[PDB]
Ligand binder design. Structure first.
Ligand code: NA
Length: 180
């Protein structure tokens, strides 16, 4: 089912909002076809970081990532950023050719910033364009906001679950605000 029309969905969790200061602590990927059918889920990787990097986390980050179990998984992880890139590339090469899929997700520009800084070999696998589901969310909020009361998110900040929610959100928009 390898195809240059398939879409690569990705979500990261980080120790904060600033790529120059903060680090990636979780990554997950999903491949859909162009019709958003989920074809395969990629590696779900808690990336090891030392305490000094975890100690940069603000209260939101600390409470969120501790309560989810991610911090414990990060502390126990034996997978570095480079190994996480290798695993993720080995998965993606089976489903989508290099340079063809936009990066897909919610406010995915932020994730791409962290990929540019910390995982440029993975960033380079994506086409330069972005499929940002939150673009459609924002346009819907302004053009017909009552549509948004028909869809809800759990928002657990477990990377695979959140990217599954991104795909479900776009699936909802296709029926609710698109006519194609
Ligand atoms: Na995200």
């Amino acid at each position: 089912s390898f195809s240059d029309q398939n879409l690569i969905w990705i979500d990261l969790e980080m120790t904060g909002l600033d790529p120059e200061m903060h680090k990636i602590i979780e990554m997950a990927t999903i491949v859909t076809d162009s019709e958003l059918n989920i074809l395969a889920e990629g590696p779900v990787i808690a990336i090891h970081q030392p305490e000094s990097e975890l100690a940069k986390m603000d209260e939101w980050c600390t409470t969120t990532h501790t309560a989810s179990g991610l911090v414990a998984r990060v502390r126990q992880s034996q997978v570095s950023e480079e190994e996480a890139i290798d695993q993720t590339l080995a998965f993606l090469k089976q489903w989508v050719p290099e340079g063809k899929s936009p990066i897909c997700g919610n406010s995915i520009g932020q994730d791409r910033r962290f990929l540019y800084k910390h995982m440029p070999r993975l960033e380079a696998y994506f086409h330069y364009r972005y499929i940002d589901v939150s673009t459609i969310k924002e346009l819907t909020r302004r053009w017909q906001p009552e549509v948004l009361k028909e869809f809800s998110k759990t928002g657990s900040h477990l990377a695979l679950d959140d990217i599954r929610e991104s795909i479900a959100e776009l699936q909802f928009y296709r029926k609710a605000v698109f006519k194609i």
